[PDB]
Design a protein around this motif. Structure first.
Motif, PDB file in Angstrom:
ATOM      1  N   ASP A  23     -22.540  13.483  33.097  1.00 18.66           N
ATOM      2  CA  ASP A  23     -23.067  14.694  32.439  1.00 18.66           C
ATOM      3  C   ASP A  23     -22.415  15.947  33.015  1.00 18.66           C
ATOM      4  O   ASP A  23     -21.885  16.764  32.271  1.00 18.66           O
ATOM      5  CB  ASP A  23     -24.603  14.751  32.479  1.00 18.66           C
ATOM      6  N   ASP A  27     -19.962  18.599  30.980  1.00 14.66           N
ATOM      7  CA  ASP A  27     -20.209  20.059  30.939  1.00 14.66           C
ATOM      8  C   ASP A  27     -18.938  20.878  31.134  1.00 14.66           C
ATOM      9  O   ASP A  27     -18.787  21.945  30.549  1.00 14.66           O
ATOM     10  CB  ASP A  27     -21.250  20.525  31.972  1.00 14.66           C
ATOM     11  N   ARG A  60     -19.689   6.478  28.118  1.00 18.91           N
ATOM     12  CA  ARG A  60     -21.139   6.441  28.034  1.00 18.91           C
ATOM     13  C   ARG A  60     -21.637   5.058  27.558  1.00 18.91           C
ATOM     14  O   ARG A  60     -22.574   4.506  28.150  1.00 18.91           O
ATOM     15  CB  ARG A  60     -21.647   7.574  27.138  1.00 18.91           C
TER      16      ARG A  60
END
Length: 121
Positions: A23, A27, A60
């Motif tokens: 994550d 970003d 992911r």
């Protein structure tokens, strides 16, 4: 066995920490250039150039399948994203420039993550 369960508890905690890491890295890609695989409909010749494509969405799917046994494996995939981009695309493009930035910004995150994996076993 109880040993098997313990290993599974460690894989699971690794996976938790790698989701945070992921994550944080995603970003650093606010434009979402690396969010999804390159489209073969839109870049039909891509696989003539790039032998192992990678993208955050693909990382992911692997992550949630607890497909990463350690941090090395995960870094390999993150480096593919960057390295594929800097080969396919020329220096003066938004794509290459986005990879460079992700690499630089990612290296901080990955520097501390390597400490947390060693630290917490």
């Amino acid at each position: 066995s109880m040993e098997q369960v313990a290993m599974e508890l460690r894989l699971t905690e690794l996976t938790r920490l790698l989701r945070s890491v992921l994550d944080q890295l995603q970003d650093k890609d606010p434009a979402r250039i690396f969010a999804q695989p390159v489209s073969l409909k839109e870049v039909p010749d891509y696989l003539d150039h790039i032998k192992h494509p990678m993208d955050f969405a693909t990382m992911r799917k692997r992550l949630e399948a607890q497909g990463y046994k350690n941090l090395h494996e995960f870094e390999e995939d993150f480096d593919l994203i960057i390295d594929n981009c800097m080969k396919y695309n020329a220096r003066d493009t938004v794509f290459y420039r986005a990879a460079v930035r992700l690499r630089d910004q990612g290296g901080v995150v990955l520097r501390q993550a390597r400490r947390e994996v060693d630290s917490i076993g």
